[PDB]
Amino acid sequence: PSMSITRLFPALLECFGIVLCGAIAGAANVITSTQAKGLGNFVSRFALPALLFKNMVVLNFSNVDWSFLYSILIAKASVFFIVCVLTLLVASPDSRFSKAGLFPIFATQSNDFALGYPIVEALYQTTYPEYLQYIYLVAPISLMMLNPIGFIFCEIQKWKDTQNASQNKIKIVGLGLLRVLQNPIVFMVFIGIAFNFILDRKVPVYVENFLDGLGNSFSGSALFYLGLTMVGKIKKKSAFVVLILLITAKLLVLPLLCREMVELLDKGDSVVNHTSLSNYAFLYGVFPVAPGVAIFATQFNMEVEIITSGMVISTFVSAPIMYVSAWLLTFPPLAYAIQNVSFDISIVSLISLIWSLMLTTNLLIAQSIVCAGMMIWNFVLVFVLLYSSLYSTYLWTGLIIIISGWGIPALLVGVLSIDSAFFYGKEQMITTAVTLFCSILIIGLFANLSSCLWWLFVELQFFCAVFNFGQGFISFGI
Amino acid sequence: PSMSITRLFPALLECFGIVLCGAIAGAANVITSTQAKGLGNFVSRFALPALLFKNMVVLNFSNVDWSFLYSILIAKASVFFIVCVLTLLVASPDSRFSKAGLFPIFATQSNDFALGYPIVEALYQTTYPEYLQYIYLVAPISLMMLNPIGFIFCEIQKWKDTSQNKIKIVGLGLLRVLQNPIVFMVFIGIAFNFILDRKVPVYVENFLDGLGNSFSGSALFYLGLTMVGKIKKKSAFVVLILLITAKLLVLPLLCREMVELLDKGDSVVNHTSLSNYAFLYGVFPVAPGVAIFATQFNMEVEIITSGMVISTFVSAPIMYVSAWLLTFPPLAYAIQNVSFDISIVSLISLIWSLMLTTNLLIAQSIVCAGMMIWNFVLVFVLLYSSLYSTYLWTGLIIIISGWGIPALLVGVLSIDSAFFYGKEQMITTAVTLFCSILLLIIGLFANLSSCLWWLFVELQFFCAVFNFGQGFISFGI
C-alpha cells in the first residue's frame, strides 16, 4: 500500500540499534561525557549544518503541498496554546511563566532529523519520495514561530526573577528571536534558501562531494550521540503525574489533532493521498521530544529534570506506539499480520531477555520458551506446547513454587489450524480462561482478562500478541 | 579512459576538506584531545569494525585477481627487507632492532581505508568496480605477514631492553596482530561469509549500513584533530626524507615492476591499468596505525608522527600529478585544466594567508585570479605582469620597482596563456629567468627550466604548478 509496512522493524532496528550501541558503551564507560563532547560538536556544528545546506540549496519550492504544512502548523499551535493556558491556570504564582514557556515547546518540538528522518526514509523511499520535502520544511518552520513565543514566556519568567526595566522590546523580544536566529537549525536554513534562489537550485560540483561526505556521516553519528546522552538520566509522585501528562501531551494528543486538521483542511482529489497525509501527520508528534528542548532547558537552568526524564522516556514509548499504530492505520489477510508482529517482537526481545537472564528468573526462562516457541512455529503439538510455558507464566507472575508451575495442568491440556491460539480447536481457550480464573484470584494479567476472553465477548488480536510474545520487554526494565 | 581523472580534485577536496574541518576545529580549541578521543572510540570500535563486517561477509572470492595480490605483497615485502637490512647495517648498536622493526612497517603500512577508499571509489565507481575488492583484500593480508615480523623486531628490541623464542618473540608478536579489529574482524567476516551464502541478514542490514556509512567522513575528521600540534634534528630530517622516498617514491616503482612482470592479462590495457593502480598503492600516506603502534610500544615516535603528518601533505600533489602523468600518454588543455584547479583553491588559502612578503601574496593572487578569467576567456593576459613581478619579488622603492616592472612595456607590445600573442613573452620570461640567475627562491629554480624549456608535455605539467600553484608556499609561510 502507501506504507512500507515491512521496513517498520528494520528501520526501527537501525535507529533503536545505533542508539543502543552508545548506551551500553556509555554504560561501559568506554566513552564518558568528555569523550562524547567531541562527537556532539561534530554532529552539531559540521555534520548537521552541512546536511541542512545540502537539503536546502536543492529542495524544490515548485511542487509542494502547502495545505498539509499549514494544517500541521496550526495543530501544533493549538497544542501549544492549550498547554500554555492550562499550565498558566494551575501553577505556583511565582513559576507560571516558566512552565508555560517550557512545557508546550517540549510538546511541539520533536527530534525528526536524527530519528524521524531514517524512519520516514524507510517508509517512503519508493512510494512517495516527496514526503522528505515536507519533513525537511515543517520542522524549521515550527522552530520559527512557536519557539520564539515559548522563549518570550521564559523571558517573562526571568522578568519575574528580576524586574529588569520593562524590556518589552529590549529583552522580551530582543533575545527571544535572537536565540532562534542564532541556532544552526534556523540561520543555516536562511543561508540554504538564499543560495537556492541565488543559483538554479543546484550545488556546485567542486563542493558537492565535500558536502555529501560531511552530510551522510550524521544519521548514525547523531543516533550514537543520543545514545551517550541517554545514560544515567532517569531519576516525585507529582513529577510522575505531570510527566505522564506531558508524554500524553506529545505522542498522544498531538497525533489526533494533526490528523483532524489534515482531514478538515487538505482537499486532495485522490482520497488515498488525503488519507496518506492524514496518517503521516498522525505519526507526526509521536517522534520523541527533540533533545533540542533539553539543551534549551539546561541553558536557561530551569527545572530541567522533567524534560530530561521526558527526553529519555519519550523515545522508549515511541518504539511500540510507532510500530502498532503503523499497523492499525494500514489494517483496514490481517490474521497473518497478527502472528507477523508477534514474530518480530519475540526475536529481538529474545536477544534482550537472554542478556537480562529464583522465582523471578524462572519467569525469564519460561518466557524465553514462549519467545523461542515463536520462530519454531513461524517456520511450521511439539511446536504448540509453548503455550504450556506461556500458561505457566500466566500464574507464575502471581505466585515448591517451581514444581507447581512445572506441574501445571497445561501438560494435561497438551495431551488432549491457522495460528498458535486457534490450532487444534477451542479447547485451549477455555484452559486460558482457567488461567484467567487464576489471574483474577502484575500488569500482564490485565492483558489476560482481555487477551484470552475476546472470543466469548483484529485490534483485539493486535494487543493479544504483544501481551504474551512481547512479554519479555519487561525483563529488560527489571 | 581507465581513470576518472576529473574526479580526483572533487574527491581530493572531499578528503582534504573533511580532514581540514577537523584540523581547523582541532586548531580552534573547540574540540580538544578528550573530545576527539570519543570520536576515536566511535570511528574504530563500531564505525570501522561495522564497515569490515559489511564488506567482508559479502565480498566475493570467485572473481578476483590473486596475481595482483601476490605482486603487491612481495613488492611491500621487498621494501620491508631492504629498509630493514639497511637500518640494521647502520644504527646505534643498542637501537638497531627498534628501527628495524618500526621504520619498515611505517614504510609498508598506509591508511587505505580512511583516505584511500574514497579516492579509489571516485576513480573507480563505474569503470572497474572490482578494484574495491583488491583495496579490501590486500591491506588486511599485508597487516598479517609483515606486521608480525615488525613486532618480532619490536620484541627483539625489547629483548635488548630486558630466551623467550616462543614465549615473547612470537607469543605477543602475533597476539598484537590477532587482537586488532583490522584482523580478527576480518576472520569473523570471512567465517560468516562461508557460513551464510555470502549474504548479510536483512534484519541487520539497515543497522550495518547505518553504522558503516558514518565512518569515512568521521575518520577523516578524527585524523584532522590528530594532525594539530604534531610537527616538531638534521639527522631526523634526512632520515625522514629517506622514509618519505621509501614510502611514496621507491615502493610505487617496486609495485609497478612487480605487477608488470607478474600479471599476464590478455588485454594489455587492463594490465597497464592494474600496474598504475599498484603504483598508486604506496603513494597513500602512512596509516594512523603505525602511529598508534609506535606510541603504544613507546619508541621514538617523533619520526613516525611527523612522517604521519608530512606523508599526507606530500601525498596530495603526488597523487594528483601522478594520476595525470600515467594517463597523459589535448594534453595542452589538460595542462591549463590542472593549472585551473590548483589556481582556484590555492587563491582561497592565499586569501586566508593574506610588507614585501604580503606583496607577493596579493601579486600571486592576481596570477590565480587571472587563471580564472583566462580559464573563462591582453587584458586577461596581463596576469603575467604580476607573474613576472613575482619572478624577482621573491629575490627582491622595492614594491615601487615591482610595480614599475618592464612587463607593462611588454604588455603594451593563441591557445594557452604562455603562447597566446606569440613568443616575445618567453624572451621576457627569459629576462625573469636572467634576474633569477642574477623556499620562495626555489620557485625561481622552476623558472630556470619552466621559462626556458622552449629555448632548451611533462615540462608544461611542471610549468603550470610553478606559477598557478605558487600560492602553495603562502599557505606554508
Side-chain angles (χ1 to χ4, degrees), chain A residues 97-111 113-127 129-151 153-158 160-171 173-258 260-276 278-330 332-344 346-353 355-385:
Chain A
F97 332 104
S98 186
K99 320 307 174 84
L102 277 75
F103 277 139
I105 58 172
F106 171 58
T108 58
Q109 269 60 61
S110 75
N111 51 4
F113 287 129
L115 276 77
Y117 191 62
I119 299 168
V120 302
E121 178 56 36
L123 271 83
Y124 323 94
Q125 61 277 64
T126 177
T127 60
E130 282 68 62
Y131 269 84
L132 310 156
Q133 325 172 13
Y134 307 102
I135 178 63
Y136 256 129
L137 281 163
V138 70
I141 296 164
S142 34
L143 299 199
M144 182 175 128
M145 346 177 288
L146 296 101
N147 244 303
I149 305 159
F151 288 126
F153 272 112
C154 328
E155 259 326 309
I156 300 332
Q157 171 55 234
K158 174 57 56 171
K160 184 39 164 191
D161 304 301
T162 304
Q163 183 275 299
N164 283 61
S166 303
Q167 323 292 2
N168 55 358
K169 305 305 171 299
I170 318 85
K171 181 190 66 156
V173 288
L175 319 96
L177 287 95
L178 164 80
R179 184 91 41 170
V180 155
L181 255 299
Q182 286 296 148
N183 264 235
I185 209 156
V186 171
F187 88 90
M188 281 284 325
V189 164
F190 282 139
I191 301 303
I193 192 76
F195 274 87
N196 187 247
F197 269 134
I198 279 161
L199 294 97
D200 206 324
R201 310 192 288 97
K202 293 160 185 164
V203 49
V205 169
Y206 271 45
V207 84
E208 188 207 350
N209 287 56
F210 164 68
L211 282 179
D212 277 9
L214 212 46
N216 287 2
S217 70
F218 166 70
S219 76
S221 203
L223 286 152
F224 207 75
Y225 178 51
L226 167 73
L228 278 90
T229 56
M230 279 189 7
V231 306
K233 295 308 166 52
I234 292 166
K235 305 309 194 315
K236 303 305 296 178
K237 52 170 292 182
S238 59
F240 274 143
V241 47
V242 303
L243 175 34
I244 298 153
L245 176 75
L246 268 303
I247 292 282
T248 198
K250 173 74 178 71
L251 297 83
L252 281 304
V253 72
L254 211 134
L256 278 306
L257 260 296
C258 291
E260 309 275 40
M261 272 337 310
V262 179
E263 59 69 23
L264 172 77
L265 264 55
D266 188 8
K267 308 307 182 69
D269 195 5
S270 86
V271 288
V272 51
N273 190 10
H274 184 245
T275 311
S276 299
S278 91
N279 56 65
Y280 186 55
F282 186 56
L283 300 60
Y284 268 68
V286 86
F287 294 4
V289 290
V293 178
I295 50 195
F296 292 161
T298 36
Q299 193 303 339
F300 304 113
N301 175 327
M302 323 304 309
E303 75 285 354
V304 165
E305 268 65 0
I306 313 191
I307 318 97
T308 172
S309 211
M311 175 58 218
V312 180
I313 288 304
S314 291
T315 315
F316 290 167
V317 200
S318 80
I321 297 174
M322 173 93 74
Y323 203 1
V324 47
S325 60
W327 270 113
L328 314 179
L329 264 306
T330 185
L334 305 191
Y336 331 96
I338 295 303
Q339 58 75 50
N340 196 328
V341 49
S342 80
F343 168 77
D344 325 290
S346 65
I347 51 184
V348 163
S349 70
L350 214 170
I351 305 308
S352 75
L353 43 56
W355 259 350
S356 181
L357 157 70
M358 321 316 147
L359 321 176
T360 61
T361 199
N362 164 242
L363 274 283
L364 325 188
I365 55 199
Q367 274 160 237
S368 53
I369 320 151
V370 202
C371 318
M374 211 35 255
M375 323 72 69
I376 48 138
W377 159 248
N378 170 223
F379 334 109
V380 192
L381 178 36
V382 194
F383 45 84
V384 200
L385 50 95

Side-chain angles (χ1 to χ4, degrees), chain A residues 9-10 13-14 17-18 21 25 30-31 34 38-39 41-42 46 206 209-210 213-214 217 220-221 224 344 347, chain B residues 7 9-10 13-14 17-18 21 25 30-31 34-35 38-39 41-42 46 203 206-207 210 214 217 221 340-341 344:
Chain A
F9 208 64
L13 269 177
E14 179 183 359
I18 295 164
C21 301
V30 294
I31 307 181
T34 60
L39 194 52
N41 287 6
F42 163 61
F46 310 94
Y206 271 45
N209 287 56
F210 164 68
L214 212 46
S217 70
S221 203
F224 207 75
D344 325 290
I347 51 184
Chain B
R7 303 281 291 180
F9 209 58
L13 272 193
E14 172 184 355
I18 296 163
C21 303
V30 304
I31 304 157
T34 57
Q35 297 188 60
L39 180 77
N41 297 1
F42 171 52
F46 324 71
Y203 273 50
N206 291 57
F207 165 64
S214 68
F221 201 77
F340 171 79
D341 317 301
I344 58 188

